[PDB]
């Protein structure tokens, strides 16, 4: 039985280096030879209590490319659950009575972990729980750093944007700190800075980081430039605009970028990465999203299969 067999993938803090390597090697193999009937006869629930299309269509195509059936709902705009006080413990106690794995997104933090106390032995995979975790977005980001850079250690990774409330930059910094010699450069408006609990964790492990005010200061040394969208209401219209809107990447800024540097963005991008970056060899944001299929397929294959054929 592989380590992940029938585990709940709730948080990145629960996965080890070894665990992260296994998922990443399996994504690589399914990307190279498809296994389209591996989950034949499995039925998986896609419970999106909060809508997220990008994430849902990607998780369900992954389920479909391994042969599984999907049943489920996308709510936020009504699909009758919690109708007449029905708790989440009770919804999951009824859904686990007939599906083989639950994929779920939910607006409150902790919800996927609570599902786990009621699902029996149906594994629960977290597709986002409020401002807390989103591991399957970190698995795909990791897979893309690894496939383009060849390694996960000894990287120079710049994180640009809203680092205070970007739930994905916080998880990728904790994942990347599992590995050696990475160096972090944070470039954020003052109001949108990387929290102390992250910085304090990096320090305690001996990992090097530094703050910079523009990308030009560090373009030269950078391998992965991971951008985040500033959400325009985390600042007021005049603040967003007034001089903090210069965390915007354009093609011209890329001149001195190393030959291997890649620009990653969990998406939607709206302002921050100008359209002309797309034609460059360094734009890897959409190829990052396509790698979501393999990272996601790998987790469903390792969780539902005792042993893997390869």
């Amino acid at each position: 039985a592989n380590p992940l067999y029938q585990k709940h993938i709730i948080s990145i803090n629960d996965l080890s280096r070894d665990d992260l390597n296994l998922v990443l090697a399996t994504a690589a193999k399914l990307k190279a030879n498809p296994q389209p009937e591996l989950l034949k006869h499995k039925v998986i629930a896609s419970c999106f209590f909060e809508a997220s299309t990008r994430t849902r269509l990607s998780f369900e195509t992954s389920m479909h490319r391994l042969g599984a059936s999907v049943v489920g709902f996308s709510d936020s705009a009504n699909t009758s659950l919690g109708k007449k006080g029905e708790t989440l413990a009770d919804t999951i106690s009824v859904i686990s009575t007939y599906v083989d794995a639950i994929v779920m997104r939910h607006p409150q933090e902790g919800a996927a972990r609570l599902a786990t106390e009621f699902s029996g032995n149906v594994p629960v995979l977290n597709a986002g729980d409020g401002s807390n975790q989103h591991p399957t977005q970190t698995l795909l980001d990791l897979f893309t750093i690894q496939e383009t850079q060849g390694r996960l250690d000894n990287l120079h990774v710049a994180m640009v944007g809203d680092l205070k409330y970007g739930r994905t930059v916080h998880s990728l910094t904790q994942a990347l700190a599992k590995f050696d010699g990475n160096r972090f450069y944070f470039i954020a408006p003052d109001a949108l800075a990387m929290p102390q609990y992250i910085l304090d964790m990096l320090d305690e492990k001996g990992i090097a980081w530094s703050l910079h005010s523009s990308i030009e200061e560090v373009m030269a040394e950078v391998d992965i430039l991971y951008m985040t969208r500033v959400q325009k209401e985390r600042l007021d219209p005049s603040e967003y605009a007034n001089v903090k809107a210069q965390f915007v990447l354009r093609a011209s800024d890329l001149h001195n970028a190393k030959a291997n540097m890649k620009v990653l963005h969990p998406l939607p991008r709206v302002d921050e990465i100008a359209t002309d970056v797309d034609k460059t060899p360094h734009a890897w944001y959409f190829q990052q999203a396509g790698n979501g299929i393999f990272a996601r397929q790998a987790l469903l294959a390792l969780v539902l299969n005792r042993d893997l054929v390869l």
Binding site: T87, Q108, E109, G110, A111
Partner: protein, 153 residues
């Protein structure tokens, strides 16, 4: 006898006596740890005299031995209570509270979006002495807070 202290109060044959509960923690601890849900004799003293330590509280609970795990809970509240077991008219063990590993059940997540608020779930926090304080990390939202914010509520 005199310099008062006892004048006939409760020497017990088998039981736990929690002494030096720091004043006002005394009633917290009965509520929180559900100590009165027992049929055994309890005798409690509040705002008990202590030239021995300012002023204190004291619960005596007989024929019950509240220990190990149960003792360490109390550390967040009555950090220096000394628990004493008794099985025949005097102290058989005198245990102090050490801080635990997890604090279950009695504590509320500060985080209002935490799912622990709406659901049939028992609270659980991971304890961490970050010298200057104890941080408490919720098992559900995984949000870390100083014990002072959590204990306020």
């Amino acid at each position: 006898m005199t310099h008062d202290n006892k004048l006939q109060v409760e020497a017990i044959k088998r039981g736990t006596v929690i002494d030096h509960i720091p004043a006002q923690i005394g009633f917290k601890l009965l509520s929180l740890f559900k100590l009165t849900e027992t049929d055994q004799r309890i005798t409690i003293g509040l705002n008990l005299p202590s030239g021995e330590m300012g002023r204190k509280d004291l619960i005596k609970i007989e024929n019950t031995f509240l220990s190990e795990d149960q003792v360490d809970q109390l550390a967040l509240y009555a950090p220096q209570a000394t628990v004493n077991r008794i099985d025949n008219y005097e102290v058989v063990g005198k245990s102090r509270p050490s801080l635990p590993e997890r604090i279950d059940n009695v504590l509320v997540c500060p985080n209002s979006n935490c799912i622990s608020h709406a659901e049939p779930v028992s609270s659980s926090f991971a304890v961490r002495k970050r010298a200057n304080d104890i941080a408490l990390k919720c098992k559900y939202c995984e949000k870390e807070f100083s014990h002072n914010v959590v204990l306020a509520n």
